[PDB]
């Protein structure tokens, strides 16, 4: 009989709050179970919209002024840790497989709308421990934002490392560790990942033999190639 | 030494399950989600925690005598998965197909957590032609190949006889006979090599199966 | 040896164990003769398994370290773990008549495999001789090895260096470098790491400052 901060019952969540000023706003979820929110700090906010499916989702807030927003009609599992003033945003109609992990440290991790994130995907925006230049003696591995654009397919067993942007329509191959930006409409793979194909776009339906066979693919295709013009180095 | 190790879930018509006398086998499953599919397992095969799923029609999976298998085989839309004689396959094995073929030869040593991914699972298109460009492609593992642990072999790849795939590899291009390859993506790291199963073999002649294949490979 | 269950299957095997701290659920198997396991004072062993296969193996874990995982010392191998080194769950050491050493003050993350032996022989087809004999692994003092890493045979990693998440290391890594990839490559030179997340300068962390001074 757990309730969110506005007194709305959320039978799929357990909430533990060790700080002050924290807010959990939760819509009418679908097919959800075994979720947890842990506030280990103050003035944090978790927003989960109507028609989101959360299954075995754990959201942990470390420190203060963190913000996590999960947009409507998405499907999510895994562990999201928002640390020391980080923002984590997951867009509409995005699906995320089991084994998902987000790691932050006063930085931002964003996933656009209409993404397909496979199982065991790690978005690691912080290294966890400091690395320094031996001559300047200053830290050189500060956390850096990860930005996954709308309509990206991230394959199974992939890590995306700090400071990486992945452009719209792109595909990250199984097993990749991505350490550098991937432009729009490209396929990348490897450890470290490299661009392996340019001028591509993906679709969810296995039935589609042409771009026009899938509504969403066609929509993004028109947006990225006709209404706009992309040409990379 | 073990009868009745398979459960059958048949949701179609014309499906065939032909099983020889298995050994040391348990907890196996075959599921037919389609029609006119066939699973044949020969005598003296060991299957443990093997799940074979058929999707669509006209698929064919055959496991030859004296092999040992675990894991998950999914044969989709008229695919053929064939495993040769005396081949051993570790836990965590995965096969993925789509109207294509995946073959493993005789006398192979396939370690744990090996994925043979002949199909990408979702389509990718060229933005200019608008046509799909990632159609499934056959995977062919020749006889007497050692595939190390935690390896994926991707679509369209052939691995030649006597070769070795290193731990943790993702193999995206053909590997010729008698080579060692490793990496992600994998590259050839050594040529003119062959492997053996027993760890006290100091010379090729110390192991009969190694000696046999070495002879065939260096003569042909 | 309260936190240890010992299965001794040979002659002349010795287990010397100091006053452990916070230790539990450990196991040792002596599957051979004349093996030695030595664990110093104030070591934390939790779900550690040490297996000795064959004879004349030696495993020593030095004081004030923390260890988990599985160590297999085979056919006259030596495995040494230095002082004040921390090792995460999923650790594995594989040997065959060779040496694996981790130095002092190391930070070894979860799921790190030190594989000094291939497990099966590979031969040159022309000489017919084996060409993948086991080769020693040396991790120097003050190294951070990231999560889900394998270090393969014959590799040395220099002091102060960092191995990135998910790496497979197949060649030596010099001192004060960061390496990552499969196979791993050097990605940055002239670096050093610290454990404390707060440190913004090398001088913010005692241990970091100490090695930085001695290494430069
Ligand atoms: Cl439910
Ligand atoms: Cl937003």
Numbering used by the authors:
A (entry chain A): 19 to 251
B (entry chain B): 26 to 245
C (entry chain C): 28 to 243
Reproduce the article's own wording on this structure.
O-acetylation of the E. coli K1 capsule is catalyzed by the acetyl-CoA dependent sialate O-acetyltransferase NeuO, an enzyme that is highly specific for α2,8-linked polySia with a minimum chain length of 14 residues. Beyond the variable poly-ψ-domain, NeuO is characterized by the presence of imperfect tandem repeats of the hexapeptide motif [LIV]-[GAED]-X2-[STAV]-X, a hallmark of the hexapeptide repeat family of acyltransferases. The crystal structures of several members of this family reveal that three hexapeptides fold into one coil of a left-handed parallel β-helix (LβH), which resembles a triangular prism. In this study, we have solved the structure of the prophage-encoded O-acetyltransferase NeuO responsible for phase-variable capsule modification of the neuroinvasive pathogen E. coli K1.
In the present study, we crystallized NeuO using a protein variant with four N-terminal RLKTQDS heptads. Protein expressed from the engineered sequence yielded crystals that belong to space group P21. The homotrimeric enzyme shares typical features of the LβH-family of acyltransferases combined with an unusual funnel-shaped outline. The predominant part of the NeuO monomer folds into an LβH-domain. However, in contrast to the canonical LβH fold, which resembles an equilateral triangular prism, the LβH domain of NeuO displays a more extended outline. Moreover, the parallel arrangement of the individual monomers is lost and the monomers are arranged with a notable inclination of 45° and 34° between each chain in NeuO and OatWY, respectively. Despite close intersubunit interactions at the bottom of the trimer, a tunnel can be observed between each subunit. However, since the poly-ψ-domain is not visible in the electron density of the crystal structure it can be concluded that it is disordered in the apo-enzyme. Albeit the structure of the first 18 residues could not be solved for the apo-enzyme, the overall outline of NeuO with the N-termini of the three subunits pointing almost 65 Å away from each other, exclude the formation of a triple coiled-coil. The structural data show that both residues are located in the proposed active site in positions highly conserved among acetyltransferases of the LβH family (MAT, GAT, VatD, PaXAT, and OatWY).
